[PDB]
Amino acid sequence: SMENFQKVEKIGEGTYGVVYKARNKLTGEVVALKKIRLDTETEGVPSTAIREISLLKELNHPNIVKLLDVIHTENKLYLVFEFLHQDLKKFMDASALTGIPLPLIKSYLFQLLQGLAFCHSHRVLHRDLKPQNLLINTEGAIKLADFGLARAFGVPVRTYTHEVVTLWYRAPEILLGCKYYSTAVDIWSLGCIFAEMVTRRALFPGDSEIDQLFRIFRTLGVPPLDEDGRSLLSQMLHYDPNKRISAKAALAHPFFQDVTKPVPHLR
Amino acid sequence: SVNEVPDYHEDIHTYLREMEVKCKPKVGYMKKQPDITNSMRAILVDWLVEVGEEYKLQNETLHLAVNYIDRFLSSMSVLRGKLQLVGTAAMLLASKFEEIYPPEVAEFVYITDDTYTKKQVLRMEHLVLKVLAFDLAAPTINQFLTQYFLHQQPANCKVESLAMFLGELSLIDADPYLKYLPSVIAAAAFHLALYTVTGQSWPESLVQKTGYTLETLKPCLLDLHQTYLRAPQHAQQSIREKYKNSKYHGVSLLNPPETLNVHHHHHHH
Numbered sequence: 217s218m219e220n221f222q223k224v225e226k227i228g229e230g231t232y233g234v235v236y237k238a239r240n241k242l243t244g245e246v247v248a249l250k251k252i253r254l255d256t257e258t259e260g261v262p263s264t265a266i267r268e269i270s271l272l273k274e275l276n277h278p279n280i281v282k283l284l285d286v287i288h289t290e291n292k293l294y295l296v297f298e299f300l301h302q303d304l305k306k307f308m309d310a311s312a313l314t315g316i317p318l319p320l321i322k323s324y325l326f327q328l329l330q331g332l333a334f335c336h337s338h339r340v341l342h343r344d345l346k347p348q349n350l351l352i353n354t355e356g357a358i359k360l361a362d363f364g365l366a367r368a369f370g371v372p373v374r375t376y377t378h379e380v381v382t383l384w385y386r387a388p389e390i391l392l393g394c395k396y397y398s399t400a401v402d403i404w405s406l407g408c409i410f411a412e413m414v415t416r417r418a419l420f421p422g423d424s425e426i427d428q429l430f431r432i433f434r435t436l437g438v439p440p441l442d443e444d445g446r447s448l449l450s451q452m453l454h455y456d457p458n459k460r461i462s463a464k465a466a467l468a469h470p471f472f473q474d475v476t477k478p479v480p481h482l483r
Numbered sequence: 484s485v486n487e488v489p490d491y492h493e494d495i496h497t498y499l500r501e502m503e504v505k506c507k508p509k510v511g512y513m514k515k516q517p518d519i520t521n522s523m524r525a526i527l528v529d530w531l532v533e534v535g536e537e538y539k540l541q542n543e544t545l546h547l548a549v550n551y552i553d554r555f556l557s558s559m560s561v562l563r564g565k566l567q568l569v570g571t572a573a574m575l576l577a578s579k580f581e582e583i584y585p586p587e588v589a590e591f592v593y594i595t596d597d598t599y600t601k602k603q604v605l606r607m608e609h610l611v612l613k614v615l616a617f618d619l620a621a622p623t624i625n626q627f628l629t630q631y632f633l634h635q636q637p638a639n640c641k642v643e644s645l646a647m648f649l650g651e652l653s654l655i656d657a658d659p660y661l662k663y664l665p666s667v668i669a670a671a672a673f674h675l676a677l678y679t680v681t682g683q684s685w686p687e688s689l690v691q692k693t694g695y696t697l698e699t700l701k702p703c704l705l706d707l708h709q710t711y712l713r714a715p716q717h718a719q720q721s722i723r724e725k726y727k728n729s730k731y732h733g734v735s736l737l738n739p740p741e742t743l744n745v746h747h748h749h750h751h752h
């Protein structure tokens with residue numbers, strides 16, 4: 217079933233499976249292949265794959281990574297994705313000394329909010345927004361990736377899995393173990409990412425849950441950011457999930473009135 | 484607050500209304516199944532209710548499993564001896580999708596009483612995913628009901644439980660309920676529950692949200708009323724047994740209304 221694909225290099229390992237760069241020998245298309253092993257004598261198809269495939273088949277948006285194909289073998293599942301050249305974590309590290317131009321930061325944040333607004337409008341929580349899961353191309357696009365930890369939610373929400381969002385990007389309502397959490401958790405994460413794009417350092421790099429909470433308590437009670445930027449950031453990082461800005465409302469913020477689509481900035 | 488998603492609830496409702504049409508099983512499908520019938524499907528669904536109770540699963544999981552079964556049987560001919568295998572794999576898939584802690588495969592094998600093997604369950608899981616093309620995020624009666632419940636002033640727990648009870652009863656009977664969309668069954672269930680408990684009617688705020696009036700809901704409402712009335716004599720009794728419990732405020736013990744007192748202009752009606 218995979219005869220037409222030539223593997224180029226291993227990209228990495230996300231929530232589940234293994235990702236390879238590959239080329240389609242017939243069309244020339246460069247793709248990312250996510251290989252998923254089953255599990256055919258014990259637990260079958262992992263829930264992570266079931267959720268990601270089902271939701272990504274539904275979610276078609278410029279700022280959500282495109283799932284192109286599902287190749288359904290007896291012992292393995294191959295997901296064919298569009299290939300993106302770089303992830304935001306590697307891009308920020310590469311920009312540690314140079315910094316990232318504000319117009320590109322603004323463009324990336326605007327696009328991430330567009331993608332996230334799309335998710336929430338289609339009853340999907342991402343729940344794993346970290347820089348490693350945000351993918352960029354040469355043309356100025358950024359996209360949400362790795363929906364392995366995603367969840368289709370109901371209105372109103374009920375109690376979902378607690379072990380969600382990597383520590384550094386985890387909203388206080390999760391840290392304190394509230395019985396409910398909602399779309400606000402994803403906004404918190406993007407707020408952390410916004411700050412991290414400006415500084416190229418994680419905003420709350422906690423060593424533990426207590427350290428994480430203390431770091432948050434310190435800051436709320438980013439130098440080079442303007443009044444509009446700090447306004448938006450403070451609303452994205454509101455303690456109260458009810459008061460925290462939505463992705464929709466964020467797109468209308470004064471900060472974005474002059475948004476463009478610059479090309480990175482490094483290769 | 485944000486748990487009720489104020490900025491997205493209308494977008495979500497509109498999307499779910501789009502998706503329920505796309506996720507709708509074939510209305511006539513059992514007529515094209517040479518070896519199985521609506522009666523056998525009723526046995527299967529009733530069994531899934533029991534399984535859901537035994538393993539303390541979400542009602543949403545039960546609704547999802549039924550959707551998967553109906554969509555699968557819309558496409559694939561299944562012999563009688565394999566019907567429960569389809570059901571078991573569906574419930575496993577629904578559990579993986581919806582549950583924080585789904586039961587392990589071994590528990591799904593155990594509930595089928597060793598008629599099937601673990602390999603069979605796992606291979607069927609894969610077949611169901613193929614047939615459904617991994618499209619598992621289906622709108623359910625339950626998903627519309629929880630949205631409808633928000634229009635209560637204030638919330639009534641007996642109304643909520645009874646609406647859920649009635650929605651659940653509809654899963655058992657392919658004739659008539661296959662011809663109605665989840666949003667419509669939820670609407671009829673909510674009205675019928677509201678009226679039975681409080682005497683209130685389908686709210687105007689829900690008329691504006693859904694575009695459904697008691698006039699458009701009448702056919703489904705009349706079916707659901709008859710189902711409610713005939714419930715204690717149905718061959719399948721697991722939903723009634725379930726809804727006797729304090730968890731669901733013992734709503735299955737309530738007496739159904741004799742008449743709905745719907746509008747009838749003619750003197751002789």
Ligand SMILES: CC[C@H](CO)Nc1nc(NCc2ccccc2)c2ncn(C(C)C)c2n1
Pocket residue numbers: 226227228229230235237248249250281297298299300301302303348349350351361362
């Ligand atoms: C999101 C995490 C994933 C695995 O580490 N990384 C990754 N990284 C991608 N690109 C960045 C990259 C390219 C080359 C080497 C390393 C990273 C990428 N492109 C498509 N896909 C997916 C959605 C299967 C990609 N996935």
